[PDB]
Design a protein around this ligand. Structure first.
Ligand code: K
Ligand code: MG
Ligand code: MG
Length: 135
RNA sequence: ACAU
DNA sequence: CGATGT
């Protein structure tokens, strides 16, 4: 119904899918960029969406913030809920970096607690998520 | 179908 | 048009 403006919004950007993957988190209210991941040479959209949420959880926990996180990714929200990224991406030498980050993100979820609500950004009603890359 |  | 996902 209503946007929760006191929140963190995250999104992935890519060049190809699979392809180069980056992600960022922004203050939903102001669009201030709060974190940005250095581009990862090969990954999928959904792996990047997943990493962005987990990074947001870690960012907010470190700062003792109870803000929710918005993502537009039905897939990544479910993977975080399950603590399991069910990616189809081949595990080989060229995908080793993204898979290391995904494995490490799952490991973090399995060793830490959080109450952060992870909310679906309703693109159809509200337009593009504030963390979008514009492409 | 829906979400990217 | 193609790909990633539930
Ligand atoms: K974009
Ligand atoms: Mg997105
Ligand atoms: Mg986007």
């Amino acid at each position: 119904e209503e946007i929760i403006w006191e929140s963190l919004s995250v999104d992935v950007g890519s060049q190809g899918n699979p392809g180069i993957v980056e992600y960022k988190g922004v203050d939903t209210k102001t669009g201030e960029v709060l974190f940005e991941r250095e581009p990862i040479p090969i990954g999928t959209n959904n792996m990047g969406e997943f990493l962005a949420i987990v990074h947001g959880l870690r960012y907010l926990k470190e700062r003792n913030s109870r803000k929710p996180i918005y993502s537009d990714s039905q897939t990544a929200i479910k993977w975080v809920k399950d603590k399991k990224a069910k990616s189809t991406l081949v595990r080989n030498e060229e995908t080793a970096l993204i898979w290391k980050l995904v494995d490490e993100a799952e490991e973090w979820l399995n060793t830490h607690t959080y109450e952060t609500p992870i909310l679906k950004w309703q693109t159809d009603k509200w337009g593009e998520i504030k963390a979008d890359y514009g492409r």
